[PDB]
Structures are given as structure tokens and as C-alpha cells.
Amino acid sequence: KKKKDKWASLWNWFDITNWLWYIKLFIMIVGKKKKK
């Protein structure tokens, strides 16, 4: 493999979405625990 590439950046970019995936799930769950 070689640095400097569209795929190489995907590792540094997707890295931010790795945990961000859970966030989207928190936005929903947080609405359930809310209750009346």
C-alpha cells in the first residue's frame, strides 16, 4: 500500500463516523426514556 490516496483518507474520515454511529442511536433512545 501507499499513503496519499482517496482510500487512505477514508480511514481518517470514517474514523469520525465510527463513534458517530452510536450518537444517531442515542437521539432515539433518549426519546424513549423521556416518557410522559
Automatic annotation (TrEMBL):
It comes from the Viruses. GO terms for biological process: clathrin-dependent endocytosis of virus by host cell; fusion of virus membrane with host endosome membrane; virion attachment to host cell. Keywords: Apoptosis, Clathrin-mediated endocytosis of virus by host, Cleavage on pair of basic residues, Coiled coil, Disulfide bond, Fusion of virus membrane with host endosomal membrane, Fusion of virus membrane with host membrane, Glycoprotein, Host cell membrane, Host endosome, Host membrane, Host-virus interaction, Lipoprotein, Membrane, Palmitate, Signal, Transmembrane, Transmembrane helix, Viral attachment to host cell, Viral envelope protein, Viral immunoevasion, Viral penetration into host cytoplasm, Virion, Virus endocytosis by host, Virus entry into host cell. GO terms for cellular component: host cell plasma membrane; viral envelope; virion membrane. It is found in: Host cell membrane; Virion membrane. GO terms for molecular function: structural molecule activity. This is Env polyprotein. It comes from Human immunodeficiency virus type 1. The gene is env.
